[PDB]
Amino acid sequence: LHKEPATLIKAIDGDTVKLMYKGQPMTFRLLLVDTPEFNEKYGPEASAFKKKMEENAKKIEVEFDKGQRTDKYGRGLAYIYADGKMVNEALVRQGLAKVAYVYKGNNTHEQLLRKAEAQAKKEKLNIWS
């Protein structure tokens, strides 16, 4: 897998963001995670955590997995990095997302993320509190 450039256009919520990628606006959905909807417990905190991480970044990057790159809604499916730190993993490590939507062939970072989840759960953070 390879990191590629993108620029933030707008925060959306805990697991989607609008980025400019190869010069075109796209919505991206984070691979391998699910955050609560803005209306549910920890929804606002997930959205805020993601928004801060991505707006404070100097450099956003997108990393596609080996499989599908857009979903049925036309959202890009990627791992997103903010100054080299994976947003998908950070949300999980903080108890603000669960590992989810693990489809065969787009699951390169599955174990990394499950390890984060286990640490969050052991710490009783947020969703696991």
Ligand X SMILES: Cc1cn([C@H]2C[C@H](OP(=O)(O)O)[C@@H](COP(=O)(O)O)O2)c(=O)[nH]c1=O
User: Rounded to whole angstroms, how far apart are CA atoms 108 and 106?
Assistant: 6
- Type of residue at 67: G
Per the annotation, the verdict on 75 as an active-site residue is yes
Site string for Ca ion, 12-51 (x = CB under 5 A): ---x------------------x-----------------
Q: Whose CA is closest to 101, among 67, 128, 127?
A: 67
C-alpha dihedral (49, 55, 86, 25), degrees to nearest 10: 120
Check whether 35 is labelled as a binding-site residue: yes
Residue 35 CB, shortest distance to Ca ion, in Å, is 5
The helix/strand/coil state of 20 is strand
Check whether 70 is labelled as a binding-site residue: no
Per the annotation, the verdict on 69 as an active-site residue is no
Q: Binding partner of residue 93 among ligand X, Ca ion, none, CB under 5 to 8 Å per kind? A: none
| Residue ranges in contact with Ca ion by CB under 5 A | 15, 34
Binding-site residue positions for Ca(2+): 15, 34-35
